Structure formats: C-alpha cells, structure tokens
C-alpha cells in the first residue's frame, strides 16, 4: 500500500514535467484578414498556456492529496 504511494508520486511528477515542457514550447512571440480572424493565433496561444496551467494546478493538487495521506498515516497509526 506504500508502493501505491511511490507509484502515484512517480506518475504525478511525470505529468508535471510533461505539462511544463509543453508550456515551454508555446511560442512567446508577440502578437489575409479572414484567415487571421478565423485562426486567432495569438488568442489561441494564451488559451493553450492557461490550459497547461489548469493542469499544473490539478497535478499539484494530487501532490497535496498524497502529502495529506502521509500526514494521516502518522496521525492515525502511531502506537499510543
């Protein structure tokens, strides 16, 4: 059951590093009228970065859930 803690940790670190690396790859370059308007490239980049952040938040949350579960094991299973 502690093995499951290690495995959850590995998976969450894996996802965070992928999501950060994806975020790093979104062009930071500063911002045919129809095409420009339909594709909305600059807007799309902002939405992409925010989507990465939403996932960085979610996965940090998972690190907190793990930390809490470790706390509770100490609080609950200590020998009196």
């Amino acid at each position: 059951s502690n093995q499951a803690l290690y495995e959850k940790l590995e998976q969450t670190r894996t996802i965070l590093s992928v999501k950060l690396a994806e975020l790093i790859n979104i062009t930071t370059i500063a911002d045919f009228a129809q095409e420009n308007s339909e594709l909305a490239v600059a807007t799309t980049s902002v939405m992409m970065v925010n989507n990465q952040t939403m996932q960085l938040i979610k996965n940090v949350q998972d690190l907190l859930i793990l930390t809490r579960s470790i706390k509770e094991k100490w609080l609950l299973n200590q020998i009196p």
């Binding site: 059951s1 902002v46 925010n50 100490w74």
Partner: protein, 81 residues
C-alpha cells in the same frame, strides 16, 4: 518528537507546493504580457519556469523520502496492517 518532525516536514512540503502554484500563476500572467508585446518581463518568465522545475524536483524528492520513512516505521512507530 519523531512524529512531530515528520508532520513538520510534511507541512514544509505543503508550503513548497503552494509556492509552485504561485510560480504557475506568475508564468501564466507573464505569458499574457509577452504576447501583448511587453518583452520587459521575459527574464522573469524564464526565472519562474526554472523555479517551478526546481521546486517540482525538491518537493517530489522530499515526498519520496517521506514515503520511505513510512515504510521503515511499520512495526516500530506505526501499527502494521
């Protein structure tokens, strides 16, 4: 006590995780600035990205140690199951 030390280490990790979230917000807000043509915050962008990584590495490493310590304390401070 020993258990007090573990909880304080775990509370420390909770602080690191909150710091990581702070970095992510800054990265996000700064990207919006860069996209608008405010290049002045590019160094800060790169710094906050780097810090998020450093914090990810440190917090997950400390967490791995905490899990190891749980495992070593089965039968000694912690009841088996």
């Amino acid at each position: 006590g020993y258990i007090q030390e573990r909880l304080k280490s775990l509370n420390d990790i909770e602080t690191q995780l909150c710091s990581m979230l702070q970095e992510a917000s800054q990265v996000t807000f700064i990207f919006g600035e860069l996209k608008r043509g405010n290049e002045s915050v590019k160094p800060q962008f790169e710094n906050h990205v780097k810090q998020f990584y450093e914090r990810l590495d440190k917090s997950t490493t400390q967490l791995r140690k905490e899990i190891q310590l749980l495992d070593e304390n089965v039968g000694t401070r912690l009841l088996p199951i």
